[PDB]
Amino acid sequence: EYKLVVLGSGGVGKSALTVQFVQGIFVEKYDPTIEDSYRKQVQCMLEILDTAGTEQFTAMRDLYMKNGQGFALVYSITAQSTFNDLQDLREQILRVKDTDDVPMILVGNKCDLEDERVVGKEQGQNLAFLESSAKSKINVNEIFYDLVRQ
Amino acid sequence: HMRMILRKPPGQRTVDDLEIIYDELLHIKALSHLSTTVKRELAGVLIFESHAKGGTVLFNQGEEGTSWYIILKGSVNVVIYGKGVVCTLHEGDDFGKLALVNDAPRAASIVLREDNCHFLRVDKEDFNRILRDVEANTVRLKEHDQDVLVLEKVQKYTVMSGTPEKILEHFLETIRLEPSLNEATDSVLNDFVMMHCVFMPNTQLCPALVAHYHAQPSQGTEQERMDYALNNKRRVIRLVLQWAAMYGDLLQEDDVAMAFLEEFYVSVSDDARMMAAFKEQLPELEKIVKQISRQPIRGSDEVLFKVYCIDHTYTTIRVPVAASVKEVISAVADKLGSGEGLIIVKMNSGGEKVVLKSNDVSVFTTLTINGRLFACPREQFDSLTPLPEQEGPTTGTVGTFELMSSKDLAYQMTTYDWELFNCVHELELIYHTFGRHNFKKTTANLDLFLRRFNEIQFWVVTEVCLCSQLSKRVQLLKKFIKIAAHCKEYKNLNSFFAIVMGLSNVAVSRLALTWEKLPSKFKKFYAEFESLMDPSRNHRAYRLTAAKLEPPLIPFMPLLIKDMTFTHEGNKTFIDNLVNFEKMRMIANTARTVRYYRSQPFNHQDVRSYVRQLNVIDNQRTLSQMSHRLEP
Ligand SMILES: Nc1ncnc2c1nc(SCc1ccccc1)n2[C@@H]1O[C@@H]2CO[P@](=O)(S)O[C@H]2[C@H]1O
Ligand SMILES: Nc1ncnc2c1nc(SCc1ccccc1)n2[C@@H]1O[C@@H]2CO[P@](=O)(S)O[C@H]2[C@H]1O
């Protein structure tokens, strides 16, 4: 049993990544109201806890952080804001957990569209790092492999 | 010879007749995907039909389906009233299955295209025992060599995808006016009636409804034609009544929908006069028309909203609730007489700023609890700083609510929560999920209710952190655990979870000296409350708790919004340019869930006044700092 958490600002692609991982968009319909909606099997069982849609309720984020074991800090390369917002979430994880270090990975979603890219590639490497894309299936699974290793 | 054999009644065919037919059924395309067992049964059931003259009607639209057909020679036209020959089937093709399986009227007429056409036929009782649960073939309805409606066994065939026009057409034709099937009919129409704004807005639906209302049949004797036209008009009215009920008071926000309805009532009452019809439906239609010409907030309601300047002076603008950010800028630049390129930013008590898009609608209620709205040129963005007003109270209110009954507080909370929850219209959940700007409608009522969760949560945190006396702070934690328990008893699970989440807040869970000396009974009371929030197996703990309860209950709102979000984001609205109606049903089901929770009603003025006028700190930094100097 494993509990991974996906974090980041709205419009960053959190929900797209989560569905793309557990099941896949279009190929199957997605029902988020049944038991196995966020649980996949990879050789172990993962449950993805995503703060998508619930960004305004920061008590939801904290509950997921508390129950989490791995953390995906997703930013969008389309917007500058979204990378900055990762500073606070990085801190907030440590505060709820009460630990020195926690297994986490940085993610730079929306890497497929590069005629709108306003974020550099090495900025994330200074702060595990991947430059993923949900709608182009790039690195989607790789993200959640990292966290089980750590 | 084969003709004669295939023309004999089912129970008059010899063993050698049956044996010759079967050997020929193996060449037939339409039957290829069937088993030996099935083909042998069909051998003693398939009837040979022949018609000589083109233009001969095989069956008419609106009739009850009695047969399934396979074309051996020739071709037929699929004809629909008000559209004519919509597509044409050839030798090898089959038709008429949909009406048989769905026990529904014929959606179209089948007319012989050419002379001398040969058919194989299977009648309804024979079709149902032999073929019904073997023929899984997706029913595709075609117009202009294009899929226009797709149906599947999800037993009936349900709409999977299709054009907005054909989906409406389908849901019109299948309405049953038979009075004992009242709630069954309303339930079927409910998916479309609620979801139409996503794929077929009123600007399209209303003309399409009028066009359908006046659609006359293009075939049959005078009586046949009059009977069909009358029931068509009865079905259109039925759908209009469901459409008008769904909206209710929201119609006032749509001019096209109101113009339509006002004209439609005139059109119906005139038809009622001279045809002597619609005896029951006309008073229903009149009741709804006359009603046109905490309380729910309307999008046309007027707001006096303060929009702040960098120096913390402000303009009071007077605009509609559903006004766009662009309309807000225009109203501010009016009173400040400017053309200096204003942008609207919303800001936290924490100082966190967000630039709002020009086409964002109804932003006034999308503010955080202590959020304010600002107008400035872009070069001022980074120099903006919060107002003192935003930083919340500095002394607590324990000396007031501590004197109040835990039971009284919980009850008054749920009364207020219910008024707020009933202001939320079913469609506001739709607008919120698919995006406010696409509908240009307000979700003000939903926004204010969702805000209440954050308010209650932060109310807990505020009162604890402004309570310096450790002895009385333990009495606080005890009282909040009590209020939560009572809230959970009234089935107000929203306020319940909000208090529990307030108690688990980083600033509150820190206070070990407060938690340690809390009575052991309440320590376990809270640990049970905190295990109901367990996000395991898709919040299984909560989901089962909520399911066991009975209708009059307030759900855990953030999870409902989460469900809605992932339903939208994980499913595509359009599939091959056809409306993914499978997705529409899912969103509708989640909304009907809210309808179920409010299907039953609910069962100390100073306590009412406190609960409704909360003063909260929503600045987590400030709340941590206060907590750090209560217990370092
Ligand atoms: N069973 C049927 N259902 C619906 N429409 C039928 C129809 N049969 C016809 S053909 C008319 C005819 C001509 C000469 C002799 C006998 C019959 N039609 C005609 O085909 C037209 C196709 O376009 P519409 O504007 S729906 O009008 C239709 C009828 O006039
Ligand atoms: N747009 C449409 N509206 C209504 N009916 C349509 C229809 N299109 C069709 S045929 C589609 C087709 C399938 C295979 C090959 C070519 C065309 N049909 C066929 O005509 C029958 C009219 O009566 P039903 O029992 S509702 O079954 C219908 C279909 O088999």
Short mmCIF file of N, CA, C and O in Angstrom, two decimals, chain A residues 24-88:
data_model
loop_
_atom_site.label_atom_id
_atom_site.label_comp_id
_atom_site.label_asym_id
_atom_site.label_seq_id
_atom_site.Cartn_x
_atom_site.Cartn_y
_atom_site.Cartn_z
N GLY A 24 -6.51 6.49 -17.98
CA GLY A 24 -6.27 7.05 -19.30
C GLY A 24 -7.51 7.71 -19.84
O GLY A 24 -8.60 7.14 -19.78
N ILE A 25 -7.34 8.93 -20.36
CA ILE A 25 -8.44 9.70 -20.93
C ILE A 25 -8.89 9.10 -22.27
O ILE A 25 -8.08 8.51 -22.99
N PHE A 26 -10.18 9.25 -22.57
CA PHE A 26 -10.79 8.81 -23.83
C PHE A 26 -10.97 7.29 -23.96
O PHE A 26 -12.10 6.83 -24.13
N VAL A 27 -9.88 6.54 -23.88
CA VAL A 27 -9.91 5.08 -24.04
C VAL A 27 -11.00 4.42 -23.19
O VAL A 27 -11.80 3.64 -23.70
N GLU A 28 -11.01 4.74 -21.90
CA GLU A 28 -12.08 4.32 -21.01
C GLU A 28 -12.78 5.57 -20.49
O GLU A 28 -12.19 6.66 -20.51
N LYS A 29 -14.03 5.43 -20.06
CA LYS A 29 -14.68 6.52 -19.35
C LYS A 29 -14.12 6.56 -17.93
O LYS A 29 -13.69 5.53 -17.41
N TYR A 30 -14.11 7.74 -17.32
CA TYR A 30 -13.58 7.87 -15.97
C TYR A 30 -14.66 8.17 -14.93
O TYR A 30 -15.32 9.20 -14.99
N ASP A 31 -14.82 7.24 -13.99
CA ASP A 31 -15.74 7.41 -12.87
C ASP A 31 -14.95 7.68 -11.60
O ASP A 31 -14.25 6.79 -11.11
N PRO A 32 -15.05 8.91 -11.06
CA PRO A 32 -14.26 9.28 -9.89
C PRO A 32 -14.97 9.02 -8.56
O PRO A 32 -14.48 9.44 -7.51
N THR A 33 -16.11 8.33 -8.62
CA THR A 33 -16.94 8.16 -7.43
C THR A 33 -16.95 6.73 -6.88
O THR A 33 -17.51 6.47 -5.81
N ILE A 34 -16.32 5.80 -7.61
CA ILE A 34 -16.20 4.41 -7.14
C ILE A 34 -14.87 4.17 -6.40
O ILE A 34 -13.95 4.98 -6.50
N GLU A 35 -14.79 3.06 -5.67
CA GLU A 35 -13.64 2.77 -4.80
C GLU A 35 -12.27 2.83 -5.48
O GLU A 35 -11.36 3.50 -4.99
N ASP A 36 -12.13 2.13 -6.61
CA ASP A 36 -10.82 1.99 -7.26
C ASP A 36 -10.48 3.10 -8.26
O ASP A 36 -9.68 2.90 -9.18
N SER A 37 -11.06 4.29 -8.05
CA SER A 37 -10.92 5.40 -8.99
C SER A 37 -9.51 5.97 -9.05
O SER A 37 -9.05 6.38 -10.11
N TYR A 38 -8.83 5.99 -7.90
CA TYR A 38 -7.51 6.60 -7.80
C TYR A 38 -6.42 5.59 -7.49
O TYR A 38 -5.25 5.94 -7.34
N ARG A 39 -6.81 4.32 -7.41
CA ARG A 39 -5.90 3.22 -7.09
C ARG A 39 -5.49 2.45 -8.34
O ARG A 39 -6.35 1.98 -9.08
N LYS A 40 -4.19 2.35 -8.56
CA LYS A 40 -3.64 1.50 -9.61
C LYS A 40 -2.78 0.39 -8.99
O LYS A 40 -2.57 0.37 -7.77
N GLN A 41 -2.30 -0.53 -9.82
CA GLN A 41 -1.33 -1.54 -9.40
C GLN A 41 -0.10 -1.50 -10.30
O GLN A 41 -0.22 -1.49 -11.52
N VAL A 42 1.08 -1.45 -9.68
CA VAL A 42 2.35 -1.45 -10.41
C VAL A 42 3.33 -2.41 -9.74
O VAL A 42 4.24 -2.94 -10.39
N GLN A 43 6.14 -4.19 -7.37
CA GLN A 43 4.83 -4.73 -7.71
C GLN A 43 3.84 -4.49 -6.56
O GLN A 43 3.66 -5.34 -5.69
N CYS A 44 3.21 -3.32 -6.58
CA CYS A 44 2.44 -2.81 -5.43
C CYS A 44 1.31 -1.84 -5.79
O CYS A 44 1.26 -1.30 -6.90
N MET A 45 0.42 -1.61 -4.82
CA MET A 45 -0.79 -0.79 -5.00
C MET A 45 -0.58 0.67 -4.59
O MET A 45 -0.12 0.96 -3.48
N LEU A 46 -0.94 1.59 -5.48
CA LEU A 46 -0.83 3.03 -5.22
C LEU A 46 -2.20 3.70 -5.22
O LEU A 46 -3.05 3.36 -6.04
N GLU A 47 -2.40 4.65 -4.32
CA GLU A 47 -3.58 5.52 -4.36
C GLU A 47 -3.16 6.98 -4.52
O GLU A 47 -2.52 7.55 -3.63
N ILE A 48 -3.53 7.57 -5.65
CA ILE A 48 -3.16 8.95 -5.97
C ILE A 48 -4.14 9.93 -5.33
O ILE A 48 -5.34 9.90 -5.61
N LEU A 49 -3.61 10.78 -4.46
CA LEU A 49 -4.42 11.79 -3.78
C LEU A 49 -4.18 13.15 -4.42
O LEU A 49 -3.12 13.76 -4.25
N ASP A 50 -5.17 13.61 -5.17
CA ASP A 50 -5.03 14.81 -5.97
C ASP A 50 -5.86 15.96 -5.42
O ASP A 50 -7.04 15.79 -5.11
N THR A 51 -5.25 17.13 -5.32
CA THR A 51 -5.91 18.32 -4.78
C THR A 51 -6.62 19.13 -5.87
O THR A 51 -6.98 20.29 -5.65
N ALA A 52 -6.82 18.51 -7.03
CA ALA A 52 -7.48 19.15 -8.16
C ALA A 52 -8.96 19.40 -7.86
O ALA A 52 -9.65 18.53 -7.34
N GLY A 53 -9.41 20.61 -8.19
CA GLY A 53 -10.79 21.02 -7.92
C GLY A 53 -11.00 21.55 -6.52
O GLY A 53 -11.92 22.33 -6.27
N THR A 54 -10.14 21.12 -5.59
CA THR A 54 -10.28 21.44 -4.17
C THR A 54 -9.22 22.43 -3.66
O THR A 54 -8.92 22.45 -2.47
N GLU A 55 -8.69 23.25 -4.56
CA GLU A 55 -7.60 24.17 -4.22
C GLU A 55 -8.01 25.27 -3.24
O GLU A 55 -7.19 25.73 -2.45
N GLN A 56 -9.28 25.68 -3.30
CA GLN A 56 -9.80 26.72 -2.42
C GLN A 56 -9.98 26.24 -0.98
O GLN A 56 -9.95 27.04 -0.04
N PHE A 57 -10.18 24.93 -0.81
CA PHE A 57 -10.30 24.34 0.52
C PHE A 57 -8.94 23.80 0.93
O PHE A 57 -8.61 22.64 0.66
N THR A 58 -8.14 24.63 1.59
CA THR A 58 -6.76 24.26 1.94
C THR A 58 -6.68 23.26 3.11
O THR A 58 -5.60 22.79 3.45
N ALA A 59 -7.83 22.94 3.69
CA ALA A 59 -7.92 21.89 4.71
C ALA A 59 -7.87 20.52 4.06
O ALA A 59 -7.46 19.54 4.68
N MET A 60 -8.31 20.46 2.80
CA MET A 60 -8.25 19.24 1.99
C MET A 60 -6.80 18.91 1.65
O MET A 60 -6.38 17.75 1.75
N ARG A 61 -6.06 19.93 1.23
CA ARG A 61 -4.64 19.82 0.92
C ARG A 61 -3.85 19.28 2.11
O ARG A 61 -3.01 18.39 1.96
N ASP A 62 -4.13 19.82 3.30
CA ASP A 62 -3.45 19.43 4.53
C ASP A 62 -3.74 17.99 4.91
O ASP A 62 -2.84 17.27 5.37
N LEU A 63 -4.99 17.56 4.72
CA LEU A 63 -5.40 16.19 5.00
C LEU A 63 -4.69 15.21 4.08
O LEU A 63 -4.28 14.13 4.52
N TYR A 64 -4.55 15.58 2.82
CA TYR A 64 -3.83 14.76 1.86
C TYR A 64 -2.33 14.73 2.18
O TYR A 64 -1.71 13.68 2.12
N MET A 65 -1.78 15.89 2.55
CA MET A 65 -0.38 15.99 2.97
C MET A 65 -0.07 15.10 4.17
O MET A 65 0.95 14.42 4.20
N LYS A 66 -0.96 15.12 5.16
CA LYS A 66 -0.83 14.30 6.36
C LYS A 66 -0.84 12.80 6.02
O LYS A 66 -0.02 12.04 6.53
N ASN A 67 -1.76 12.40 5.14
CA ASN A 67 -1.90 11.00 4.77
C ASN A 67 -0.92 10.56 3.68
O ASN A 67 -0.76 9.37 3.43
N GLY A 68 -0.26 11.53 3.05
CA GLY A 68 0.67 11.25 1.96
C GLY A 68 2.00 10.64 2.39
O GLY A 68 2.38 10.70 3.56
N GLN A 69 2.68 10.03 1.42
CA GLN A 69 4.00 9.43 1.62
C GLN A 69 4.95 9.88 0.51
O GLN A 69 6.16 9.84 0.67
N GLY A 70 4.37 10.28 -0.61
CA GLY A 70 5.12 10.80 -1.75
C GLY A 70 4.42 12.02 -2.30
O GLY A 70 3.20 12.13 -2.20
N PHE A 71 5.18 12.95 -2.88
CA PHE A 71 4.62 14.23 -3.28
C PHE A 71 5.09 14.69 -4.66
O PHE A 71 6.28 14.82 -4.91
N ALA A 72 4.12 14.93 -5.54
CA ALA A 72 4.40 15.47 -6.87
C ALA A 72 4.07 16.96 -6.89
O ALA A 72 2.91 17.35 -6.72
N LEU A 73 5.09 17.78 -7.07
CA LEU A 73 4.93 19.23 -7.08
C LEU A 73 4.86 19.70 -8.53
O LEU A 73 5.87 20.02 -9.14
N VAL A 74 3.65 19.73 -9.07
CA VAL A 74 3.46 20.00 -10.48
C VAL A 74 3.37 21.49 -10.75
O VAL A 74 2.59 22.19 -10.12
N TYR A 75 4.20 21.96 -11.68
CA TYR A 75 4.07 23.31 -12.22
C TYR A 75 3.85 23.26 -13.73
O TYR A 75 4.15 22.26 -14.37
N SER A 76 3.30 24.34 -14.28
CA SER A 76 3.05 24.44 -15.70
C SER A 76 4.07 25.37 -16.33
O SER A 76 4.34 26.46 -15.82
N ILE A 77 4.64 24.94 -17.46
CA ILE A 77 5.61 25.76 -18.18
C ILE A 77 4.93 26.84 -19.04
O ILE A 77 5.61 27.65 -19.67
N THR A 78 3.60 26.84 -19.05
CA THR A 78 2.82 27.86 -19.77
C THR A 78 2.75 29.16 -18.97
O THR A 78 2.69 30.24 -19.55
N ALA A 79 2.75 29.03 -17.65
CA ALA A 79 2.60 30.18 -16.76
C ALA A 79 3.71 30.25 -15.70
O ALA A 79 4.03 29.25 -15.05
N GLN A 80 4.27 31.44 -15.55
CA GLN A 80 5.35 31.73 -14.60
C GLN A 80 4.93 31.54 -13.14
O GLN A 80 5.70 30.98 -12.34
N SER A 81 3.72 31.99 -12.81
CA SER A 81 3.17 31.96 -11.45
C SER A 81 3.32 30.59 -10.81
O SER A 81 3.85 30.46 -9.70
N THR A 82 2.86 29.58 -11.53
CA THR A 82 2.77 28.20 -11.06
C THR A 82 4.07 27.60 -10.52
O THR A 82 4.03 26.72 -9.66
N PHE A 83 5.22 28.05 -11.03
CA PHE A 83 6.51 27.55 -10.53
C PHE A 83 6.83 28.14 -9.16
O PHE A 83 7.34 27.44 -8.28
N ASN A 84 6.54 29.43 -9.00
CA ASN A 84 6.78 30.15 -7.76
C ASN A 84 5.98 29.57 -6.60
O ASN A 84 6.50 29.41 -5.50
N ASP A 85 4.72 29.23 -6.87
CA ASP A 85 3.80 28.72 -5.85
C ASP A 85 4.29 27.42 -5.20
O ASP A 85 3.76 27.00 -4.16
N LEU A 86 5.30 26.80 -5.80
CA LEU A 86 5.88 25.56 -5.29
C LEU A 86 6.73 25.75 -4.03
O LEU A 86 6.90 24.80 -3.26
N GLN A 87 7.25 26.96 -3.83
CA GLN A 87 8.04 27.30 -2.64
C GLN A 87 7.24 27.06 -1.35
O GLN A 87 7.75 26.46 -0.40
N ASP A 88 5.99 27.51 -1.35
CA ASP A 88 5.11 27.47 -0.18
C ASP A 88 4.63 26.05 0.12
O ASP A 88 4.61 25.63 1.28
#
